[PDB]
Amino acid sequence: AMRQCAIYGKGGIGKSTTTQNLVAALAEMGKKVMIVGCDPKADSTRLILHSKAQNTIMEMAAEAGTVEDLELEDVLKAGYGGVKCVESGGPEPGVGCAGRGVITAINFLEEEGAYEDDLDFVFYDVLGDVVCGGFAMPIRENKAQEIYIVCSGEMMAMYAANNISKGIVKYANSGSVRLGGLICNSRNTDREDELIIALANKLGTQMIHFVPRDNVVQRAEIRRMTVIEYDPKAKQADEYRALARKVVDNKLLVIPNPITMDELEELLMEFGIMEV
Amino acid sequence: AMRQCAIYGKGGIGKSTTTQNLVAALAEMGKKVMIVGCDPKADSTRLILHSKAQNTIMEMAAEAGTVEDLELEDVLKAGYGGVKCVESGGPEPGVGCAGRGVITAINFLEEEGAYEDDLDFVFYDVLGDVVCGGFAMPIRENKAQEIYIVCSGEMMAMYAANNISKGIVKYANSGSVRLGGLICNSRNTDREDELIIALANKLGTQMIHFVPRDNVVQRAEIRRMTVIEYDPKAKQADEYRALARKVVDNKLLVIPNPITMDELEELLMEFGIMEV
Ligand SMILES: Nc1ncnc2c1ncn2[C@@H]1O[C@H](COP(=O)(O)OP(=O)(O)O)[C@@H](O)[C@H]1O
Ligand SMILES: Nc1ncnc2c1ncn2[C@@H]1O[C@H](COP(=O)(O)OP(=O)(O)O)[C@@H](O)[C@H]1O
Ligand SMILES: [Mg+2]
Ligand SMILES: [Mg+2]
């Protein structure tokens, strides 16, 4: 068995930092993991690979001829902890649909046998500012059973979490895509943990972990590493280990209850975030 | 003559707050302005209209029958300073293309004569996390000659500015869409102004204004107002007036020079943002 998980959230919220650190913690526990980058920024694997980024399936297919000319063994790259990594890529700005590469990539990985019996987890790192095209495909086509949304007390981050939740609801009549939890990536604001716990309760899920804001992240990433690899003794490394443990142990996977903008604003006013 | 301008940038960066406050300052100077909301969040006009939000063209067309059944006089709403306001709307998450409503809305406004001779400015407030579909339409179809990008010293905000710039370059062989400037919406970080000035120089544009982070914005928005209306004496009101003056006077409209991720990272390292 393998658990197929997707990490969604608005741009810049911390999806790739959280995913790569979570996955490094899973590998440190002995889990076999693959990360599939589903964001055109295409830097979702660089901290596992010690790299600038990773060449994308779209780029590699263009050089080979067609995507079918690619060999899976040439595409997947392994880094820290044996974690396997791939990037979808996407068309250049202004050309096409920004999510088109996600569809090509996931289909290629499935056709070519990337989902090997020995994997314990797959994590898709997915752009979440719009829920359409290839960015909706992991939900629409039942590719990621467990969605975890990275968010914060920022209104826009909570709005994105609600929109992703609406996407999960839309496709709930078939497949098994569910909301597994919210991950609060802290902005160092008062009562932010309580705010995200309250949002999670309204949606029917949970806040699986509160990730502190810690500059060790910047120090590790300047060196192209997860915190897990850069400083295994860091307080923040233990935070990512706690998140990983709770993901492993999580059994709550729900069809969420999206909320109104009125409810979102009331959450913000209640926890005094806008008055901090 | 009227100047057609678009405000792009990543989600949550400050597009709608900056646009509505800039436009309120323009109205306070005597300019006639229309705001066209081109973000599915559909709250781009609420501070002009003193409102929760505004019903969208997509919603109104659905109730009327077709978009052609709508009357422009029923759709446009005027608020503070006589500023005229409309929202495009968009399909629900997981359904269709998130930008489809932008195309319908702009075409409707053009067909129905919204671009009246007496307007001095039109501002499109456009989602910028992806540059495709209806979000690319103001660039691809030559609707906004002057693009202003709201950004900050955040890596993701600068990446978005670069992607929007790539979109402008892609369509430069026809039409007249140009980059007019970067607006830095401050994160209260050291040397952020210098960083955005340097990014602008690399792109070939300018940093037209540095907007400070000021909690008066939250106090005004809780009351559904621009700072311009809520407290005309506020320091931040004068900031938006300075931005408005410089937009009025701006003559630099360029085909930008997009940069590499290497150059973006070097800008970040140089100005010590990641080490603050
Ligand atoms: N917990 C944290 N503490 C400090 N910095 C963080 C943390 N999480 C993310 N960051 C920083 O925030 C920025 C954006 O994170 P990233 O994971 O790239 O966002 P996304 O993938 O959602 O666009 C990066 O510079 C990253 O180092
Ligand atoms: N200069 C500023 N000072 C303080 N708060 C700001 C400022 N600019 C924007 N904000 C706040 O940031 C949040 C996001 O701004 P908004 O304009 O809605 O972003 P976008 O339209 O780009 O998604 C809002 O809560 C807004 O009040
Ligand atoms: Mg990322
Ligand atoms: Mg907005």
Cβ-based interface (< 8 Å): residues of A facing B: 10-12, 40-41, 43, 52-53, 91-99, 127, 129-133, 136, 139-140, 154-157, 159-160, 163-164, 166-167, 170-171, 218, 222, 261-262, 269, 274-275
Q: How far apart are CA B145 and CA B158, in angstroms?
A: 21
CB of A181 closer than 8 Å to CB of A208: yes
CA distance A191 to B79: 35
Indicate the burial class of A111 (C-beta count within 10 angstroms; 0-12, 13-18, 19 or more). exposed
B11 annotated as ligand-binding: yes
Report whether B185 contacts B13 (CB < 8 A): yes
Please give the Cα distance from A92 to A66 (Å, whole number): 18
Q: B203 and B161 in contact (C-beta within 8 Å)?
A: yes
Strand A207-211 relative to strand A3-8, pairing: unpaired
* A57 marked ligand binding residue: no
DSSP string across B53-107: ----HHHHHHHHSSGGG--HHHH-EE-GGG-EEEE---PPTTSS-TTHHHHHHHH
Torsional sign, CA A97, A98, A103, A109: positive
Those residues with Cβ within 8 angstroms of residue A254's Cβ, 6 or more apart along the chain or in another chain: A178, A179, A203, A204, A205
Ligand nearest to the CA of B11: 2
- Pair of tokens at residue B114: 């919204």
Please classify residue A110 by burial: count the beta carbons closer than 10 Å to its beta carbon, then call 0-12 exposed, 13-18 middle and 19+ buried. Answer: exposed
d(CA B74, CA B97): 26
Helix intervals (H) in A30-98:
46-49, 57-64, 72-75
Rounded to 10 degrees, what is the CA torsion of B263, B268, B271, B274? -160
Rg of chain B's alpha carbons, rounded to an integer? 18
Distances from the Cα of A17 to the Cα of A244, B2, B11, B112, angstroms: 13, 45, 19, 48
CA–CA dist B243, B210 (Å, integer): 8
In angstroms, how far is the first alpha carbon of chain A from the final one?
46
* Terminal C-alpha separation, chain B: 46
Bridge-based pairing of strands A207-211 and A146-151 is unpaired
Residues B45, B34 contacting (CB under 8 angstroms): no
CB contact under 8 A, B94 and A139: yes
Known catalytic membership, residue B74: no
Which amino acid makes up residue B100? R
* Order of strands, sheet of B178-185, starting from the edge strand that comes earlier in the sequence: B77-78, B84-87, B33-38, B121-126, B3-8, B146-151, B178-185, B207-211
- 8 Å CB contact between B5 and B246: no
B17, B87, B211, B218: which to mutate for ligand 2, most atoms within 8 A of CB?
Answer: B17
Residues ≥6 apart with Cβ < 8 Å to B131: A93, A94, A98, B139, B163, B164, B166, B167
Tokens matching residue B176:
């007249």
Contact A271, A194 (CB under 8 A): yes
Active site residue B10: yes
- Experimental technique, in short, is X-ray
Say if CB A98 and CB A91 are below 8 A apart.
Answer: yes
d(CA B8, CA B157): 10
Distance CA(A17)–CA(A219), nearest Å, equals 12
Is residue B120 within 8 Å of B3, Cβ to Cβ?
yes
- Nearest residue in A to B164, CA atom: A93
Write out the two tokens for B136: 């690319």
Would you say A21 and A227 are in contact if contact means Cβ atoms under 8 Å apart?
Answer: yes
Q: Taking a C-beta distance cutoff of 8 angstroms, is the pair A12, A64 a contact?
A: no
CB B92 within 8 A of CB A162: no
| Residues pairing with B34 in the sheet | B84, B122
DSSP state of A26: H
> DSSP letter at B275?
G
Which residues form the pocket of ligand 2, taking CB atoms under 6 Å from any ligand atom? Answer: A 155-156; B 9, 11-17, 185, 211, 213-214, 217-218, 221
A119-to-A99, A122, A144, A148, B234 alpha-carbon distances in Å? 26, 7, 14, 19, 58
Note whether B33 and B4 are within 8 A (CB): no
Whole-number Å distance between alpha carbons of B67 and B63: 9
CA gap A120, A26 in Å, rounded:
9
The residue whose CA is least distant from atom 3 of ligand 1 is A213
CB A227 within 8 A of CB A155: no
Cβ-contact B105, B92 below 8 angstroms: no
Integer Rg of chain A from CA = 18
E strand residue ranges, chain B? 3-8, 33-38, 77-78, 84-87, 121-126, 146-151, 178-185, 207-211
Give the C-alpha separation, B161 to B150, whole Å.
Answer: 8
Quickly count: other Cβ atoms within 10 Å of residue B204's Cβ.
Answer: 14
Cα A185–chain centre separation: 12
User: For residues A7 and A148, is the Cβ–Cβ distance under 8 A?
Assistant: yes
